[PDB]
């Protein structure tokens, strides 16, 4: 039972120090996520990631791998309350916006933090998202977190972690707690490690994009937009150099002599027409390359910025990078075994046709019972 | 560090009878 | 080109004379409390056949109060090595600031000087000080400190005050342990190469930043190594009623936007706390 003895004590020895309430994210990453919210391409991808995950519908349900005959749906009334809160979080907040904040913070920092206020009997009351930038956490002596610090001076709620909290006789908590869902990385260090974010490896191209675009705006206003650099010689009696100017200039659309030829008798004036291309100021070729980098690093098929690419973007990066980690984090500590949080795949409008044909063809097979024909395409029982 | 001495208490017994 | 993860630091704390003093928590920055100076005498052994009485003399109730002092500091960086480094200067400095605050609070509650620092019981000098006698050697009158004196001082505590621990340096403890009787035997731990009795049971809490009378463990004293009479040796007090420590708010850290000129990003850190001495009759100081 509860080993309480993890091999994560390798770091509290000297690499770390207990009882310090260290921050979870470096200030550099916080600022990096901030300026990336106004960057055109970065913001575009970030709002896309949050948007699509915000479209999925929640529900509590039986898990398929239910070998636990001793179901952990302790009361079946905590589950209905859990269903209520999953669809209606803390007042002035919907489940959709909760999903948006969770997946967004997961994309910018690689973490998910929440808050629960279970009343007295495993019945969850409300759920709050936590600002990942200004969230501090405090470690135990063995290997893990014991409390979370949230606020600098006034707000000092030492919210206990899920591992250490007043539990029921069955295992469910009775008081408040937090989650701190984490994304793993190299060298283990389950929580002592550095974040795992696409923002790590996009620093250079976004810096290039800003530099090249700044060059574009500047050269737009500052390069003369005039043509026909005409030049005379120092033998032309300024007083008639005006009229030859008035002769050439007064040919504009809607002029005195507009569209007629220009005759200069004697004192041959010499015109040269400037090119002023101004058609590659943003460096089109070394701009779309960097756009493809900051879009591909977020896991976005370029075609999105045809339907097969949408199917890929949904079921190659969105599903197993924001949907599976969020559900297992919730399913880990929000309800007992046998029951867990599930989202209906058929709510995604892009995969409806795919589910349709797969269901249709499976209908044709015969060496297969009806229940497993169901379970292979959702439809529990 | 320079070599520091290790002076310890000697045979301390009396405070009330001087020897003749 | 093979940078390791080794971070040898090699710096020490003291012990902590914090779990000894009575701890109290206050929210506001000014607390106040009553005290009974003396009950006074009421009623005498009057004679008989005297239809009268005497009013005696009433007692005295005083009303004292105390503030809590703040402790603050500031530190900045350059945001360039902070970005390019292979370490975490932020956490390093947070740890260093907490360490400095702890050691400063300890030394203040010990030896604080009046204004804007809690008056330590050392500088208070209202704990009765018992000074030990000097010894004779070859006619010279060098001062000394014996196990006899140590036992006398630990025993002379008033019994009705309660159980009282003692505080003293490990150098003093080693000096005590390495005593020799007349012929050659050790006084404590006869014939086991070391004397290490259970401290918690002998009620002797140990620390490392007391005045340490044996300078650098180099003042045993037979010639020019005398204890330099007038040096603190040990203290013994009912600490749960002699010195109180008031706590208001733990350490807090805050970036200072403004003043950060885009080159050196700056944090500030702060705390508030304090201490005082109540009835400084419980408590004595053994000195050379």
UniProtKB/TrEMBL annotation, chain A:
<protein>
    <submittedName>
        <fullName>Portal protein</fullName>
    </submittedName>
</protein>
Automatic annotation (TrEMBL), chain B:
<protein>
    <submittedName>
        <fullName>Virion-associated protein</fullName>
    </submittedName>
</protein>
From TrEMBL, chain C:
<feature type="disulfide bond">
    <location>
        <begin position="14"/>
        <end position="209"/>
    </location>
</feature>
<protein>
    <submittedName>
        <fullName>Major capsid protein</fullName>
    </submittedName>
</protein>
<feature type="disulfide bond">
    <location>
        <begin position="76"/>
        <end position="264"/>
    </location>
</feature>
<feature type="disulfide bond">
    <location>
        <begin position="126"/>
        <end position="280"/>
    </location>
</feature>
């Amino acid at each position: 039972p509860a080993p309480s003895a993890n091999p994560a004590k390798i770091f509290i020895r000297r690499f770390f120090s207990a009882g310090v309430a260290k921050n979870v994210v470096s200030y550099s990453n916080v600022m990096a996520a901030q300026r990336a919210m106004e960057h055109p391409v970065a913001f575009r991808c970030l709002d896309k990631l949050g948007l699509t995950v915000q479209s999925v519908k929640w529900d509590v349900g039986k898990d398929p791998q239910n070998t636990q005959v001793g179901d952990g749906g302790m009361s079946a009334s905590q589950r209905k309350a859990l269903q209520q809160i999953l669809q209606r979080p803390n007042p002035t907040m919907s489940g959709a916006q909760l999903r948006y904040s969770a997946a967004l913070s997961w994309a910018c920092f690689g973490r998910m933090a929440f808050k629960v206020s279970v009343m007295s009997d495993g019945s969850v009351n409300a759920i709050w998202p936590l600002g990942i930038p200004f969230l501090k956490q405090k470690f135990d002596r063995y290997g893990d977190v014991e409390s979370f610090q949230y606020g600098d001076e006034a707000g000092k709620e030492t919210i206990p972690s899920f591992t250490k909290v007043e539990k029921n006789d069955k295992g469910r908590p009775i008081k408040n707690y937090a989650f701190m869902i984490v994304k793993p990385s190299i060298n283990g260090a389950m929580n002592f490690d550095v974040q795992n974010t696409p923002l790590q490896a996009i620093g250079v191209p976004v810096a290039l994009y800003d530099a090249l675009m700044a060059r574009a705006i500047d050269s737009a206003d500052g390069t003369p937009n005039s043509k026909w650099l005409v030049t005379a010689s120092r033998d032309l009696d300024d007083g008639q150099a005006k009229e030859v100017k008035e002769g050439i200039e007064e040919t504009k659309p809607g002029g005195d002599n507009g569209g007629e030829i220009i005759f200069i008798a004697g004192t041959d004036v010499k015109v040269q027409e400037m090119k002023n291309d101004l058609s590659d100021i943003h460096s089109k070729v070394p701009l779309d390359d960097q756009a493809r980098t900051i879009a591909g690093n977020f896991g976005i098929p370029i075609a999105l910025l045809y339907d097969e690419s949408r199917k890929a973007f949904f079921e190659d990066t969105i599903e197993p990078g924001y949907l599976t980690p969020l559900e297992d984090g919730f399913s880990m500590f929000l309800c007992g075994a046998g029951y867990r949080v599930i989202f209906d795949r058929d709510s995604i409008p892009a995969l409806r046709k795919s589910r349709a044909d797969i269901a249709a063809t499976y209908d044709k097979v015969t060496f297969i019972t009806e229940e497993e024909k169901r379970e292979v395409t959702g439809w529990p029982a | 560090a320079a070599p520091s001495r290790l002076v310890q208490p000697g045979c301390f017994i009396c405070r009330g009878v001087a020897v003749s | 080109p093979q940078v390791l993860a080794l971070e040898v630091d090699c710096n020490i704390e003291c012990a902590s004379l914090l779990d000894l003093y009575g701890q109290i928590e206050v929210s506001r920055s000014t607390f106040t409390y009553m005290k009974i100076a003396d009950y006074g005498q009421l009623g005498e052994y009057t004679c008989d056949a005297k239809c009268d009485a005497e009013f005696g003399e009433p007692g005295n109730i005083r009303h004292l109060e105390g503030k809590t002092y703040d402790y603050r500091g500031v530190f900045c960086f350059n945001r360039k090595n902070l970005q390019e480094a292979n370490y975490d200067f932020l956490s390093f400095m947070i740890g260093a600031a907490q360490r400095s605050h702890r050691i400063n609070r300890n030394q203040a509650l010990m030896i604080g000087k009046g204004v804007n620092e809690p008056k330590g019981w050392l500088t208070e000098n209202c704990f009765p000080v018992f000074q030990t006698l000097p010894v004779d050697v070859n006619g010279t009158s060098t001062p000394a400190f014996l196990a006899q004196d140590w036992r006398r001082f630990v025993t002379s505590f008033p019994a009705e005050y309660g159980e009282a621990r003692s505080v003293m340096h490990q150098n003093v403890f080693g000096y005590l342990a390495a005593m020799v009787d007349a012929n050659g035997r050790f006084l404590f731990g006869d014939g086991d190469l070391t004397f290490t009795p259970d401290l918690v049971r002998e009620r002797i809490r140990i620390s490392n930043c007391l005045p340490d009378p044996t300078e650098g463990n180099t003042k045993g004293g037979t010639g020019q190594d005398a204890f330099a009479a007038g040096s603190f040796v040990a203290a013994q007090a009912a600490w749960k009623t002699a010195f109180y420590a008031v706590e208001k708010r733990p350490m807090f850290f805050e970036q200072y936007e403004g003043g950060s000129s885009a080159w050196c990003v700056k944090y500030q850190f702060g705390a508030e706390d304090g201490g005082f001495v109540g009835c400084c009759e419980h408590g004595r100081i053994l000195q050379i």
